Amino acid sequence: SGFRKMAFPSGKVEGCMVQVICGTTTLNGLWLDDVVYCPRHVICTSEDMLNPNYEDLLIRKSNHNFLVQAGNVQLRVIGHSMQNCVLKLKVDTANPKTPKYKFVRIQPGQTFSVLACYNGSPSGVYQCAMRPNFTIKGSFLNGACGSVGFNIDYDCVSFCYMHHMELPTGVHAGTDLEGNFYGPFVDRQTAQAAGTDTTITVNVLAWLYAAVINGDRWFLNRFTTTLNDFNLVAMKYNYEPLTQDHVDILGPLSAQTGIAVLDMCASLKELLQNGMNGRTILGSALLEDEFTPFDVVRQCSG
Amino acid sequence: SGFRKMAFPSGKVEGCMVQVICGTTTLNGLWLDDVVYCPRHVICTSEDMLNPNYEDLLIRKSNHNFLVQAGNVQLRVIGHSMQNCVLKLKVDTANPKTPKYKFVRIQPGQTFSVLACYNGSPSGVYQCAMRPNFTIKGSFLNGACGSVGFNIDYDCVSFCYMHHMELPTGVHAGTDLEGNFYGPFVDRQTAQAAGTDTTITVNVLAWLYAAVINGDRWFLNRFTTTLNDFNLVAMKYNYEPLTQDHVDILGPLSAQTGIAVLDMCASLKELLQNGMNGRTILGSALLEDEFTPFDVVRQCSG
Ligand SMILES: *C(=N)[C@H](C[C@@H]1CCNC1=O)NC(=O)[C@@H]1[C@@H]2[C@H](CN1C(=O)[C@@H](NC(=O)C(F)(F)F)C(C)(C)C)C2(C)C
Ligand SMILES: *C(=N)[C@H](C[C@@H]1CCNC1=O)NC(=O)[C@@H]1[C@@H]2[C@H](CN1C(=O)[C@@H](NC(=O)C(F)(F)F)C(C)(C)C)C2(C)C
């Protein structure tokens, strides 16, 4: 029993982290086979970051201008290219610690583990949800760029995020491993703001199933609701519409607990309309939306 | 910016996890050099766990009765001994992935990362504080025993916990790596309960400094307090006495922010007496006590 925000074991990703230095800018890179992937703004000076022309800055760099270090070993750069907002550095040595991997573009509402790194060295790991506004609530200081987000499925690492920047309110933005940003952000130091966020309904429902499994059942009412009436009520509380695809994804938790999804929707409807009356659910005084149905199943059945 | 509950990168510990099977009981072991450490109740059947005589059960086991598997390799057990509540299995192969390590007994109020494992396979990582009642708020299912807690200092892993059992309310108990339990618990399946817990004052203060660094400063009042008056007020809210050793440990955060510890104590005193008036601090509606001053410094200065 117990329910905690849990990250994937980071070992497979730790073995891929390297330091990339270009001139006087240093950040992290991800070394998979003979390629190192890193944010393209490693080629900028502080001044260039205000309004960079990456294509122009890159044409004046050669392979030798990129210094890649993996522990106490310098890797020789033998090729370079830019793909969207990431640079790919071909190196003369394939990473022997390369796990089985894939690059995936995650959807809003999904979670992943972040391995925060500085100077190519892993410092910590934590779980994030890709918010509906395409930001994550991370924790990153100067030099964290190139830190990656991932999921692990059996032996396979699905890399989904690479860190690039921090937005107002202390939220974070980045790209997939093909360098395409999540959200309408650009890698330039200019005024940018995230759009208004929304609560991930299907995740709040998943976390209510986690609470039931853990013995916190006070919020369970005796009613049911229709999907339409639930979505009409939940819209005013800035909750995402719950789709039939979301109801299907909640099926395993619903079957495990014997609580129909629409019955849990009636319990959530009452919690939204009446509040929690000073009570907690899994120790929280607020409804949590950063656990997916898979995250819950992972911990509440194995 | 940002502040998240963050675990240490688990790679160094993942390379030490093995599966230990004795008869029909399976749990996790920690393989360091040529020794595998695991909870002694691996030698029990379900029936033995109700009231076990470990010394008696162990005398009827030989080395061959312990099957240790590290990935796809079976390790041969060539010696065994029991030290308090842990069994030590000498194996014929030294773990080549053994990091630099030490065994430490952590103090109440301190935090560590837990690598939850099943069948010798790491599943997830999360941060815990050793509560003043010597329990942790973990997340463990059947088969999790032998999962370990640790801290990482530069290249050195300090192992401090090995998981043994779950107590009422879904809290967890275990031993140090010398097999001595934290708290007045025993490894027997009989009615046991944790003592009344207390709030770790120095950690709440550390987390208020984290909030200030992150720009959440609404709770800062214009007053100071004496240590005696702070401790008189905080006793009724079930907060641990704040000692001069705790005030000294908060020194780096106090110097970084320019807020004296006793001034933060006056702000905490007002929060305890008046509540948070529906407001949040670092997104939380409750005061958090599971971040040590070191955990805060780690994230709010690097
Ligand atoms: C990469 N190492 C850093 C990570 C930042 C540093 C503070 N916390 C983080 O997550 N990335 C940057 O410094 C990027 C980088 C230029 C400026 N920048 C920012 O994150 C800035 N943000 C923005 O300009 C904004 F709001 F548009 F997102 C900063 C004000 C420094 C936080 C580039 C190329 C975008
Ligand atoms: C080790 N694999 C498990 C981990 C437990 C299983 C459920 N969640 C966990 O943390 N440890 C045990 O099953 C230990 C083991 C016998 C019984 N036990 C317990 O944790 C039980 N608890 C107690 O009897 C109590 F309350 F005293 F702590 C159980 C009721 C199964 C949760 C031994 C030898 C203590």
Numbering used by the authors:
A (entry chain A), B (entry chain A): 1 to 302
Provide passages from the article that reported this PDB entry.
Severe acute respiratory syndrome coronavirus 2 (SARS-CoV-2) encodes a main protease (Mpro, nsp5, 3CLpro) that is essential for virus replication. Mpro cleaves coronavirus polyprotein 1a and 1ab at 11 junctions with a conserved Gln residue at the P1 site, a feature with no known human analogs. The essential function in coronavirus replication, together with the absence of closely related homologs in humans, identifies Mpro as an attractive antiviral drug target. The SARS-CoV-2 Mpro inhibitor, nirmatrelvir, was found and developed as the oral COVID-19 treatment Paxlovid (nirmatrelvir/ritonavir).
